[PDB]
Write a protein that binds this ligand. Structure first.
Ligand SMILES: CS(=O)(=O)c1ccc(C(=O)[C@H]2C(=O)[C@@H]3CC[C@@H](C3)[C@@H]2O)c(Cl)c1
Ligand SMILES: CS(=O)(=O)c1ccc(C(=O)[C@H]2C(=O)[C@@H]3CC[C@@H](C3)[C@@H]2O)c(Cl)c1
Ligand SMILES: [Co+2]
Ligand SMILES: [Co+2]
Lengths: 380, 380
């Protein structure tokens, strides 16, 4: 069931913003590891004396990396005279966020019809305000409310190129890398208590619940067309193996964004390219499932994937799950930075062709059992 | 003249330590950009609950990247029970350093005969103590004194593999990159006042002055065999173009390390490999000199480099200088991170063959005039 209860018009995920100590080094690492090109900048060279912000893109996926300069460079500014291009930025908030949580996601941004209306309706329905609607160059409106922990949900709306004050990047610094990633599929938060987090977020958005030991309980919130997807996890205590959700909360100093799932139009090519680069500056992947997992795929998805395609999954360590509507291929990176907190998922979905419906095939919850069974039966 | 006045036995540069917000991302970027391999680690996986430290090597060059974890992970520890592998590390100091200066060098480390003797003699001769001698696993002694700003000179001495508590890296995570870099040639500091900085450092080391508008004044301190080389710069005010030393001091919030010069055994190969990677996660280089600079090289160094070798310098943007003893080839990167502060120099020296004497060919001061002349005569 989908009551289509969104309290304001939501379009698609727009961008993800990482708060960094040094934006240059994180952005360069991510560009090479994920195949994203440098597409826009706001920094000293563009007149921004407050923060350095670099935008990477791959298809519709937008990753923004931001770090503060010395406050001394902008000590004479006030908000009405700021040279910041993101008016919600604050030196103290950014430094506090990074000292507390390490490298991670500050903003999950969605494009909406009217960011001021979305902010007003959200706050009227219980959202904790974080940054009020600000109109940039009479062209783009941006506003922010608290999502969970120190993560904000950022609303962006456009009258009619990322944000005013950003400049497109010099051709020579813009190498056209592309490993096949095309958009953000979902963004997942870890919280101490799932119930209160769901009630809060669904309360102010009108997002509905998307239709679905482990060490976790989870639920997924979704917009009207189910293209904005926000799963949330809580830990389950007292399990044999300690909950990875609880480990996250300890190392992150509380709730925050756990993973970003990036849709690829060719997951085989994406994983070939990313794995070639794992040990030369890119991203590492979690240990691959044993061969028994891939033998068991024939009975599970032999009507969807050929043997050669199953063998390709095995060569790349790709996992496969299926619900009643479609099939998904997925794989997980090791943590993106020093702490065992945020990681990336690469996903591609098969089925639900109408365009493809959001969330086609689910989120891979069936792979908790299948991985487990595989490992025990591989002990053999 | 070389009075050989070192107050303790100094061997060679040992390592450079960067203090980072996220050590993983900086280390991965530097590994790919410079061709350095991952060789050692001290982090959660090795039992270190305090800091994450990753060692890259190329030949004898050792770059260490360190960032703090959440203090909560080590809140029950005291110094006598620490899980830190570098006992001088402090969460507050590291966070303060990074918030103040951004990504940069915390420690210039030299290997000495006896780190406790070096510390004691240094402090008896005016060095400001930073971390007292600590013996690690009865095998390695480490001590630190203030050099300039928040940069320390670190003494390391070995009884007889980087440091105890570090583990060698998994073969699969250790890709054998190598672009030809072999050792640290010199490390350069920027200070507000050159005179007092020289008197302080030469006072406690016994290092001697190495034998030698612009916007700077400089002088070089050197150990007995002139293999440890520490140039220091101060700004010159009131010049037409504002001093780049003063820009550094403003953006860095004071004195600190300006550049690291890395010797290559094949500067042509190093620059081919680094330039191939500039726009795919590596390092950018400063704008190349105009063709008039390379025409003028024939009269300056035509007895040292062939025409083809001069053309190779031109293809790669390499600069050339010469003194009375030898010739040097050099080139400079753009800043390594967000702020216009620290950068890298790649160098290779020709001549002074006895082994090669330290500092053979100088430091390129003659290139301030030659670049200037080149640009004016290229206006032509
Ligand atoms: C094969 S598996 O390694 O056990 C495995 C399988 C699927 C995932 C996900 O992507 C998750 C989500 O997206 C939603 C949030 C909680 C649920 C749903 C999942 O855990 C992960 Cl993290 C690990
Ligand atoms: C051709 S140039 O771009 O004008 C140019 C040429 C040489 C250098 C150096 O390496 C320096 C040093 O190593 C020592 C410290 C101050 C002196 C000596 C130099 O400035 C630099 Cl930074 C830029
Ligand atoms: Co997922
Ligand atoms: Co130099």
């Amino acid at each position: 069931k989908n009551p289509k209860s969104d309290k304001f018009k939501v379009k698609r995920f727009h961008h993800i913003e990482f708060w960094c100590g040094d934006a240059t080094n994180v952005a360069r690492r991510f560009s090479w590891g994920l195949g994203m090109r440098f597409s826009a900048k706001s920094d000293l060279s563009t007149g921004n004396m407050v923060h350095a912000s670099y935008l990477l893109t791959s298809g519709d996926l937008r990753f923004l990396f931001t770090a503060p300069y010395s406050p001394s460079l902008s000590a004479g500014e006030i908000k009405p005279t700021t040279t910041a291009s993101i008016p919600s930025f604050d030196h103290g908030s950014c430094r506090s966020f990074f000292s507390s949580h390490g490298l991670g996601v500050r903003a999950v941004a969605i494009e909406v019809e009217d960011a001021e209306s979305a902010f007003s309706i959200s706050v009227a329905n219980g959202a904790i305000p974080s940054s009020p609607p600000i109109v940039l160059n009479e062209a783009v409106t941006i506003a922010e409310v608290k999502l969970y922990g120190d993560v904000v949900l950022r609303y962006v709306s456009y009258k009619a190129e990322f944000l005013p004050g950003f400049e497109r990047v010099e051709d020579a610094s813009s190498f056209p890398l592309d490993y096949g990633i095309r958009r953000l599929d979902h963004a997942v938060g870890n919280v101490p208590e799932l119930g209160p987090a769901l009630t809060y977020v669904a309360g102010f958005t009108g997002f509905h619940q998307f239709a679905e030991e482990s060490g976790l309980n989870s639920a997924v919130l979704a917009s009207n067309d189910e293209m904005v997807l926000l799963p949330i996890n809580e830990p389950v205590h007292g399990t044999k193996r300690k909950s990875q959700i609880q480990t996250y909360l300890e190392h992150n100093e509380g709730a925050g964004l756990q993973h970003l799932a990036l849709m690829s139009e060719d997951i085989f090519r994406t994983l070939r390219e990313m794995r070639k680069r794992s040990s030369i500056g890119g991203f590492d992947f979690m240990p691959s499932p044993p061969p028994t997992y891939y033998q068991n795929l024939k009975k599970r998805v032999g009507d969807v994937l050929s043997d050669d395609q199953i063998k390709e999954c095995e060569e790349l360590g790709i996992l496969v799950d299926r619900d009643d509507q479609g099939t998904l291929l997925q794989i997980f990176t090791k943590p993106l930075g020093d702490r065992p907190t945020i990681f990336i998922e690469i996903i591609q979905r098969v089925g639900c062709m109408m365009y493809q419906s959001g969330g086609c095939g689910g989120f891979g919850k069936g792979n908790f059992s299948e991985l487990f069974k595989s490992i025990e039966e591989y002990e053999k």
